[PDB]
Design an enzyme around this catalytic site. Structure first.
Site, short mmCIF file in Angstrom:
data_model
loop_
_atom_site.label_atom_id
_atom_site.label_comp_id
_atom_site.label_asym_id
_atom_site.label_seq_id
_atom_site.Cartn_x
_atom_site.Cartn_y
_atom_site.Cartn_z
CG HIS A 62 -1.84 -1.22 1.22
ND1 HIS A 62 -1.68 -2.25 2.13
CD2 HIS A 62 -2.86 -1.59 0.42
CE1 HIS A 62 -2.57 -3.19 1.88
NE2 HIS A 62 -3.30 -2.82 0.85
CG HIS A 92 2.71 5.76 5.88
ND1 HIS A 92 2.46 5.62 7.23
CD2 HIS A 92 1.59 6.31 5.36
CE1 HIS A 92 1.23 6.09 7.48
NE2 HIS A 92 0.66 6.52 6.37
CG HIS A 94 -0.62 8.57 1.77
ND1 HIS A 94 -1.51 7.52 1.75
CD2 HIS A 94 -0.24 8.70 3.06
CE1 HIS A 94 -1.63 7.08 3.00
NE2 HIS A 94 -0.87 7.78 3.82
CD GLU A 104 -3.97 9.70 2.60
OE1 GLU A 104 -3.62 9.58 3.79
OE2 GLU A 104 -4.65 8.87 1.99
CG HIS A 117 0.38 10.30 6.78
ND1 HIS A 117 -0.56 9.54 6.14
CD2 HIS A 117 0.10 11.61 6.59
CE1 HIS A 117 -1.39 10.39 5.58
NE2 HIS A 117 -1.03 11.65 5.83
CB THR A 196 -5.94 8.28 5.26
OG1 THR A 196 -4.60 7.79 5.18
CG2 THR A 196 -5.94 9.60 6.01
CB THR A 197 -5.14 2.98 4.92
OG1 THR A 197 -4.58 2.54 6.16
CG2 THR A 197 -4.20 4.00 4.28
#
Ligand SMILES: COCCCN1C=C(N)c2cc(S(N)(=O)=O)sc2S1(=O)=O
Ligand SMILES: [Hg+2]
Ligand SMILES: [Zn+2]
Length: 258
Positions: A62, A92, A94, A104, A117, A196-197
């Site tokens: 992911h 991590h 995005h 995000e 994040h 957010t996941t």
């Protein structure tokens, strides 16, 4: 099927297995700078990342996570809107397929190229597992990335990416200093939200820094060469691993600056 960011298993489908997706404090959200309430009672953030112990970097299908040893108060976040001490467990990013998307959270509908994040859990709860069952268990520090000049502190991460191209791969990644990813100013916006996941758990106090960090196009380009798929499977470029903005609903975004 296990969640992802594709047409058939992306954000618009998450609610089916994770009904909390349609909940009250879902993230990310659009930060409307003109509606955000400057709040004088917010203390400045206290980022103590000097004793941070990075362990490894892993591609989890992911995103890629850099994990840290959180067995003790090594790297912690305090102050800001937080009560107590939060330990850094991992960070991590995005990112998107193009420089105009990837973040995000958006600021007045503006999307950034990527978003970092830094995940922390509330020590009061004993362990990460208990923290995620609590309405104030996590604190995630979000940092936007804009395409400009290179971020030297990010290079060590960019250089190891070849070793974790596919899902499940990990590589030792010790002595990484997360301080090299911080912008100059620690001004921020904060609001109660969620991961957010999936599992989209609702207990993250989001702390989004106002000032983005710059990374070169070559640096973000390397992110885009990772794969969602594991080795041996058909290649799916890891891009656009972000969740669109969720409705703010009954929440207010507080600002630590005027
Ligand atoms: C029950 O176990 C839950 C584990 C959740 N973890 C994994 C998510 N992908 C995830 C997403 C996070 S993010 N991007 O919203 O901050 S943090 C984070 S996490 O707290 O490190
Ligand atoms: Hg929770
Ligand atoms: Zn994230």
């Amino acid at each position: 099927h296990h969640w992802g960011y594709g047409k058939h298993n992306g954000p618009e489908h998450w609610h089916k297995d994770f009904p909390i997706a349609k909940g009250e404090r879902q993230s990310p959200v659009d930060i409307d700078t003109h509606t955000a309430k400057y709040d004088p009672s917010l203390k400045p953030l206290s980022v103590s990342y000097d004793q941070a112990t990075s362990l490894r970097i892993l591609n989890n299908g992911h995103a890629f996570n850099v994990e840290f040893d959180d067995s003790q108060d090594k790297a912690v976040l305090k102050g800001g809107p937080l009560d107590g001490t939060y330990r850094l467990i991992q960070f991590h990013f995005h990112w998107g397929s193009l420089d105009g998307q990837g973040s995000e959270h958006t600021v007045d509908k503006k999307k950034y190229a990527a978003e970092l994040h830094l995940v922390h859990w509330n020590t009061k709860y004993g362990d990460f597992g208990k923290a995620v069952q609590q309405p104030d268990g996590l604190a995630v520090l979000g940092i936007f990335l804009k395409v400009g000049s290179a971020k030297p502190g990010l290079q060590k991460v960019v250089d190891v990416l070849d070793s974790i191209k596919t899902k499940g791969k990990s590589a030792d990644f010790t002595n990484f200093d997360p301080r090299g990813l911080l912008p100059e100013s620690l001004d921020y916006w904060t609001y109660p939200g969620s991961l957010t996941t999936p599992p989209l758990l609702e207990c993250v106090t989001w702390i989004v820094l106002k000032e983005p960090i710059s990374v070169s196009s070559e640096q973000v380009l390397k992110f885009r060469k990772l794969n969602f798929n594991g080795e041996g499977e058909p290649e799916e470029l890891m891009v656009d691993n972000w969740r669109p903005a969720q409705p703010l609903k009954n929440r207010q975004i507080k600002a630590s600056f005027k």
